[PDB]
A = this chain, B = another copy of it.
């Protein structure tokens, strides 16, 4: 029933633009919306990837590997799944494994890859693939994991046991000012609810 009628640029930065979206409502009435988009999406099936990295080690409980970074939009430190934008021509899987390695040092193995999922659909068109990767923490490659941050990347790695993920996140939030990412909290909540 509903569809887009027009998209008018309001303001275009180097990385983001704001648009006035005109669309048809399902009563047949024309309405508008203020829409955010990135300027960086070409032929990728999504803007970005986030990686769900399951660290596996003999005679260890499984950990979820998370990263902590300053996020200028938030004006503070955030705890997130490792993530980055997909380079032009890069597959989501390759992006995931590459970002995981850059941000954490770990060399993962692909497990699954979601369809494109929306980040904040009442606000932006931004999408990611959520890519689950296992990390064989008993492999020598993953013994001394060294993050390879790009220019202006400053990332800390935080690995938390899957079996206590939500309480461990709460304990970190209780100890300093930081925000947990909504996808991480969602995943931690489901692990409790299961």
Judging by beta carbons under 8 Å apart, are B74 and A118 in contact? yes
Task: Using A127-B179, A194-B194 as known contacts, say yes or no to A120 and B117 having CB atoms under 8 A apart.
Answer: no
Copies in the complex: 2
Nearest CB in chain B to that of A16: its residue? B34
Judging by beta carbons under 8 Å apart, are A119 and B10 in contact? no
Interface residues on A, range: 35 or more
- Residues of A41-82 whose CB lies within 8 A of B: 50, 52, 54, 70-75, 77-78, 80
Judging by beta carbons under 8 Å apart, are A119 and B120 in contact? yes
Judging by beta carbons under 8 Å apart, are A80 and B132 in contact? no
In whole angstroms, what is the CA distance A37 to B185 when docked? 21
Write the residues of chain A forming the contact surface with B, with a CB cutoff of 8 angstroms.
1-4, 10-11, 13-16, 18, 20-21, 23, 25-26, 31-38, 50, 52, 54, 70-75, 77-78, 80, 83, 114-128, 130, 132, 152, 154, 162, 170, 173, 179-191, 193-194
